[PDB]
Scaffold this active site. Structure first.
Site, short mmCIF file in Angstrom:
data_model
loop_
_atom_site.label_atom_id
_atom_site.label_comp_id
_atom_site.label_asym_id
_atom_site.label_seq_id
_atom_site.Cartn_x
_atom_site.Cartn_y
_atom_site.Cartn_z
N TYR A 27 0.75 -1.38 -0.05
CA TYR A 27 -0.12 0.02 -0.05
C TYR A 27 0.75 1.54 -0.11
O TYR A 27 0.23 2.41 -0.28
CB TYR A 27 -0.91 -0.18 1.08
CG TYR A 27 -2.28 -0.93 0.90
CD1 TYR A 27 -2.00 -2.24 1.05
CD2 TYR A 27 -3.58 -0.45 0.31
CE1 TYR A 27 -2.98 -3.20 0.65
CE2 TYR A 27 -4.41 -1.50 -0.06
CZ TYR A 27 -4.07 -2.58 0.15
OH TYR A 27 -5.31 -3.56 -0.24
N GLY A 29 2.60 4.22 -1.37
CA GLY A 29 2.81 4.74 -2.66
C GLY A 29 1.91 4.11 -3.82
O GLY A 29 1.33 4.93 -4.32
N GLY A 31 -0.67 2.10 -3.64
CA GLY A 31 -2.29 1.55 -3.29
C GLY A 31 -2.74 0.30 -3.99
O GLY A 31 -1.71 -0.60 -4.03
N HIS A 47 -3.86 4.85 5.62
CA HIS A 47 -3.69 6.03 5.14
C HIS A 47 -4.43 6.05 3.98
O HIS A 47 -5.29 7.14 3.48
CB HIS A 47 -2.24 6.44 4.89
CG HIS A 47 -2.07 7.88 4.27
ND1 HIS A 47 -1.39 8.15 3.25
CD2 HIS A 47 -2.12 9.00 5.10
CE1 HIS A 47 -1.59 9.32 3.10
NE2 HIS A 47 -1.94 9.90 4.10
N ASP A 48 -4.18 5.26 2.86
CA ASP A 48 -4.99 5.28 1.75
C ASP A 48 -6.68 5.51 2.09
O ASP A 48 -7.07 5.99 1.17
CB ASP A 48 -4.87 4.12 0.66
CG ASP A 48 -3.49 4.08 -0.11
OD1 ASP A 48 -2.92 5.25 -0.24
OD2 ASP A 48 -3.06 3.24 -0.56
N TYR A 51 -7.65 9.12 2.75
CA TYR A 51 -7.76 9.70 1.68
C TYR A 51 -9.06 9.26 0.94
O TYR A 51 -9.88 10.00 0.19
CB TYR A 51 -6.64 9.54 0.63
CG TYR A 51 -5.49 10.51 1.04
CD1 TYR A 51 -5.19 11.46 2.09
CD2 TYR A 51 -4.31 10.52 0.08
CE1 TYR A 51 -4.05 12.07 2.65
CE2 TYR A 51 -3.01 11.17 0.60
CZ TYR A 51 -3.14 12.14 1.73
OH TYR A 51 -1.87 12.44 1.86
N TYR A 64 -1.55 22.30 2.61
CA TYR A 64 -1.88 22.75 3.99
C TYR A 64 -0.80 23.19 4.70
O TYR A 64 0.33 22.91 4.51
CB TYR A 64 -2.65 21.87 4.72
CG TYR A 64 -1.93 20.33 4.81
CD1 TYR A 64 -1.02 20.17 5.79
CD2 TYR A 64 -2.19 19.26 4.00
CE1 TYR A 64 -0.04 19.17 6.07
CE2 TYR A 64 -1.45 18.26 4.02
CZ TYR A 64 -0.28 18.09 5.12
OH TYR A 64 0.20 16.79 5.13
N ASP A 89 -2.39 12.77 7.21
CA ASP A 89 -0.90 12.78 6.98
C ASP A 89 -0.10 12.74 8.10
O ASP A 89 0.83 11.76 8.52
CB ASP A 89 -0.34 13.82 6.09
CG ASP A 89 -0.94 13.47 4.77
OD1 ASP A 89 -1.33 12.71 4.20
OD2 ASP A 89 -0.40 14.60 3.92
C1 LIG Z 1 -8.44 4.20 -0.80
O1 LIG Z 1 -7.47 4.79 -1.56
C2 LIG Z 1 -7.58 5.94 -2.57
C3 LIG Z 1 -8.81 6.39 -3.01
C4 LIG Z 1 -9.14 7.78 -3.97
C5 LIG Z 1 -7.95 8.50 -4.23
C6 LIG Z 1 -6.38 7.99 -3.33
C7 LIG Z 1 -6.27 6.89 -2.60
C8 LIG Z 1 -5.63 9.10 -3.54
C9 LIG Z 1 -4.31 8.57 -3.30
C10 LIG Z 1 -2.86 8.30 -3.83
O2 LIG Z 1 -2.59 8.34 -5.31
O3 LIG Z 1 -2.05 7.75 -2.88
C11 LIG Z 1 -6.36 10.11 -4.69
C12 LIG Z 1 -5.43 11.39 -4.96
N1 LIG Z 1 -7.71 9.65 -4.74
C13 LIG Z 1 -8.72 10.64 -5.69
O4 LIG Z 1 -7.95 11.67 -6.20
C14 LIG Z 1 -10.13 10.55 -5.95
C15 LIG Z 1 -10.56 11.66 -6.78
C16 LIG Z 1 -11.95 11.82 -7.22
C17 LIG Z 1 -13.10 10.84 -7.11
CL1 LIG Z 1 -14.88 11.34 -7.89
C18 LIG Z 1 -12.86 9.83 -6.35
C19 LIG Z 1 -11.19 9.57 -5.70
C1 LIG Z 2 1.67 10.56 -6.09
S1 LIG Z 2 2.15 9.17 -6.84
O1 LIG Z 2 1.48 9.09 -8.64
O2 LIG Z 2 1.66 7.97 -6.12
N1 LIG Z 2 3.48 9.14 -6.92
C2 LIG Z 2 4.35 9.22 -5.58
C3 LIG Z 2 4.08 8.66 -4.44
C4 LIG Z 2 5.00 8.67 -3.15
C5 LIG Z 2 5.54 10.29 -2.84
N2 LIG Z 2 6.39 10.40 -1.54
O3 LIG Z 2 7.06 11.49 -1.37
O4 LIG Z 2 6.45 9.68 -0.58
C6 LIG Z 2 5.91 10.99 -4.04
C7 LIG Z 2 5.20 10.75 -5.43
O5 LIG Z 2 5.29 11.55 -6.36
C8 LIG Z 2 6.42 12.40 -6.97
C9 LIG Z 2 7.62 11.87 -7.41
C10 LIG Z 2 8.89 12.76 -7.79
C11 LIG Z 2 8.68 14.18 -7.17
C12 LIG Z 2 7.24 14.66 -6.68
C13 LIG Z 2 6.23 13.70 -6.25
#
Ligand SMILES: COc1ccc2c(c1)c(CC(=O)O)c(C)n2C(=O)c1ccc(Cl)cc1
Ligand SMILES: CS(=O)(=O)Nc1ccc([N+](=O)[O-])cc1Oc1ccccc1
Length: 121
Positions: A27, A29, A31, A47-48, A51, A64, A89
């Site tokens: 999980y 990064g 997910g 955490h996932d 969000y 934030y 977070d």
């Molecule tokens: C249980 O896990 C989740 C579920 C949804 C999530 C994420 C992680 C992350 C987290 C990630 O990438 O680590 C983002 C950014 N999610 C969304 O933006 C999202 C946007 C619009 C709709 Cl309508 C529904 C969900």
């Molecule tokens: C958000 S993603 O599509 O899950 N990529 C991603 C995952 C974890 C982290 N982090 O800093 O723990 C940082 C992450 O993405 C970046 C990689 C390089 C520079 C800035 C963000």
């Protein structure tokens, strides 16, 4: 947003979010699916899941602000999406901090196929 989170992680655990946490267990990064391999993996899972309760927010890009009241992480008043993210977070940060002693490297860069199983938040 990630900047905040990552910085929060480094202060808390001394390890860098990327790559110590961007590809840990099932999980952290990436997910997706699976059974959390361990405490840290669970942190990432919870955490996932955190969000997941904020459908119309953008954990990744929304920024934030937080402060430290002696070592305590304190989210500052912002938008409501911002506050709820920050709480999410802070928990992960703490959580990681709470299981550093079992952070295992064999879960770094964990292959996807070994991540199958069910788990509802
Ligand atoms: C249980 O896990 C989740 C579920 C949804 C999530 C994420 C992680 C992350 C987290 C990630 O990438 O680590 C983002 C950014 N999610 C969304 O933006 C999202 C946007 C619009 C709709 Cl309508 C529904 C969900
Ligand atoms: C958000 S993603 O599509 O899950 N990529 C991603 C995952 C974890 C982290 N982090 O800093 O723990 C940082 C992450 O993405 C970046 C990689 C390089 C520079 C800035 C963000």
């Amino acid at each position: 947003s990630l900047l905040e989170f990552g910085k929060m992680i480094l202060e808390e655990t001394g390890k860098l979010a990327i790559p110590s946490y961007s590809s840990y267990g099932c999980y952290c990064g990436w997910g997706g699916k699976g059974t959390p391999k361990d405490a840290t993996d669970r942190c990432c899972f919870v955490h996932d899941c955190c969000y997941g309760n904020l459908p119309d927010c953008n954990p990744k890009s929304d920024r934030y602000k937080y402060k430290r009241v002696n070592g305590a992480i304190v989210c500052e008043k912002g938008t409501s999406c911002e506050n709820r993210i920050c709480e999410c977070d802070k928990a992960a940060a703490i959580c990681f901090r709470q299981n550093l002693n079992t952070y295992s490297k064999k879960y770094m860069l964990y292959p996807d196929f070994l991540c199958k199983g069910e788990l509802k938040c």
